[PDB]
Design a protein around this ligand. Sequence first.
Ligand SMILES: Nc1ncnc2c1ncn2[C@@H]1O[C@H](COP(=O)(O)OP(=O)(O)O)[C@@H](O)[C@H]1O
Ligand SMILES: Nc1ncnc2c1ncn2[C@@H]1O[C@H](COP(=O)(O)OP(=O)(O)O)[C@@H](O)[C@H]1O
Ligand SMILES: [Mg+2]
Ligand SMILES: [Mg+2]
Lengths: 388, 394
Amino acid sequence: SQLHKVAQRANRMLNVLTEQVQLQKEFYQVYAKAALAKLPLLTRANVDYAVSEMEEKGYVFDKRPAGSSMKYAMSIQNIIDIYEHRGVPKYRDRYSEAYVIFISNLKGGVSKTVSTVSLAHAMRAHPHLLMEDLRILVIDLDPQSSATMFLSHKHSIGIVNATSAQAMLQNVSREELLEEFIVPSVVPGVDVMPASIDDAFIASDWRELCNEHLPGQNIHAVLKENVIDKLKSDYDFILVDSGPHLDAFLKNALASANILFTPLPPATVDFHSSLKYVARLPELVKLISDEGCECQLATNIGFMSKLSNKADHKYCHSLAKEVFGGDMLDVFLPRLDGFERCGESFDTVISANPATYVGSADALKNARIAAEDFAKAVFDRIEFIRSN
Amino acid sequence: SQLHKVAQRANRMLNVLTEQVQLQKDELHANEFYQVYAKAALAKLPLLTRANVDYAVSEMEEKGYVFDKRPAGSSMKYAMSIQNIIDIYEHRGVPKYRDRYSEAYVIFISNLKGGVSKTVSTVSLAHAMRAHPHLLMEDLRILVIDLDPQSSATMFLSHKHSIGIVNATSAQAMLQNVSREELLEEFIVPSVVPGVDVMPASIDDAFIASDWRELCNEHLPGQNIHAVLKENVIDKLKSDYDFILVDSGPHLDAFLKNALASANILFTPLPPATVDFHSSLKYVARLPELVKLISDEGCECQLATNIGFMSKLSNKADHKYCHSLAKEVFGGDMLDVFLPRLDGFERCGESFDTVISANPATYVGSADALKNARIAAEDFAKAVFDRIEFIRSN
Ligand SMILES: Nc1ncnc2c1ncn2[C@@H]1O[C@H](COP(=O)(O)OP(=O)(O)O)[C@@H](O)[C@H]1O
Ligand SMILES: Nc1ncnc2c1ncn2[C@@H]1O[C@H](COP(=O)(O)OP(=O)(O)O)[C@@H](O)[C@H]1O
Ligand SMILES: [Mg+2]
Ligand SMILES: [Mg+2]
């Protein structure tokens, strides 16, 4: 009974530490008016007419003095509103229901979380996708909660309780999900439904917890029916992140996705493992199907992750190209220091402010551009699939 | 069905890759471990003197013992392997650990919070304990059972061109329920440091964990689902090892439960990061509940205590706060030593080497980094060993 003893001491500690984070409780990117001209469909002249015409109508743009005078400090919203003023339709004007993206791989360390949060921020803030005025939701279903930490400033969530796995069991309305479970991330337009280590116990007793709280409901269609379907009209993209564990969460995530992206690692051994997952994927969809709901899983796109020039890497890259063939993204996430440094302070290569960044400013830009290139390639891929 | 297409091509590629690594399967030769001592260096070890070593060495050669000398100098030099030193201690009559205890002792370093250093501690503990200068006379035999589909332990313990893929895994051994002779011949693999072995894991074990109930029903009818590891694997190796370490992933599944039911003692690595620490505490506060669950539904846990230790601790002030909190929680069950965050552990982890198996000459970094990592690892291992000794004899 020495555990009971220590376990209690740790309990008083939690209740104490929990009242810490509670008692505790921004996007740097701004564009100079002239900078908008490099954005698609916009020119120096038409931005001047838009800003001019909108102002005369009562619009007020963000500004900040650079010495004495006061220039324009355009926020993403200002830009989005300028495009709207110029009759450029938004993504929601051609697609009516949210598309669910699931970056998955049973093998860990392959960059599932980083590629997921990077894709969320980079798609929203992509210079070429701002006109799309995208609304993105990242649903964290990994008790390790890496996505949560990356997306909402660690001093925010700290000890989370309103969890995605909780949402699944509580089965609440759209309004409650937006108001009580979903929290904003640093980049406006990108939200997150958090996770917490406590979700490990939920996954562990999923079977029973379902019989108690969701009687008669197919245990594999919960995330899809109790959460995603209720939010389909408030978001353009919904990204689900789960751990590399063949859980109820992994299954619920698979049953709700429209598309899968498999991040492929460069080392031969990890690449080998990943192919095992890609090979048994149809087996997994078959199971979930044979016992409940059907997976609307269209395709499975692969892409190299943390790739480099090592001979071994080039080799795997050739093999992956062989396996996925056409469904192989033409862009990949290379291994960069920017992603590591950022990963250490749980910040996105998009939200990380260069003025605060500890490391070379060059390295940061490189990863940002890499995240952006990756996001644009993903978005374009969905586009082709969705309008064909 | 443009998902079954890739699966097909993927499956084919596996065959190719498999047969490829199936050739480069180098044979891990024992006399390849870098560590060697000049005859004179043994004198610095406990119980050994320059004179009792020369006497021992002389008598052994008289009985035909063959020292693997090197052709250097007018008369060959003794390039002593940790095994030579072990054989010398044996010849002087100092008792080995297996002379001091009669059954393997099962250690389980665990935490539901991942990234806390469960694998690196487990792996460093094994190697550092075997090769620790003050523990050579113990002639330890250590087995690391990898039950994490990620197989990080398997990777640190062998060579990338030594184990490659993994077919006969621990999860597989649990369900097949084979003989001790079979576990020894087919399922256990040696690591880079002789004396420490590993029962491997593979990604395919994630499917086994996923369908544990159905698989136990079809392969192990009547057997309690939480006692499979204890009865089908560990109990059959009780005489073959002094220590058996179990490594599992951060999941509250069958593997985690079986490891617990087989453990003699538990070690909990506690991270300094306020968020990580808080998560670790939630795990410590639910341990009794978990043990109670296993009990209520079948077998009992012989879990003695739960020792806690700071993992990846820095000189930062923040860290010193958690350390205190941790002390309040664990109190006496806190380890006197902690695992500090060091470059040696990082650079080594990058190449899946242990700060014990990593040859300093080859280390691409600062010798001091590697040297400090090894020492820290050795002090941690001696501390765990000394603590087990006090618990075991008392
Ligand atoms: N492209 C990259 N370059 C450098 N480091 C990366 C990259 N992608 C991921 N990482 C780092 O690799 C580790 C694994 O990524 P993570 O997203 O947590 O994987 P999974 O989601 O596979 O667990 C993290 O510590 C992260 O900072
Ligand atoms: N003392 C340490 N100093 C520096 N890096 C460490 C230390 N202990 C562990 N690590 C590194 O931290 C990461 C997490 O450790 P790992 O043993 O894999 O954790 P778990 O077993 O938590 O997955 C690894 O990348 C590892 O190389
Ligand atoms: Mg993840
Ligand atoms: Mg581990």
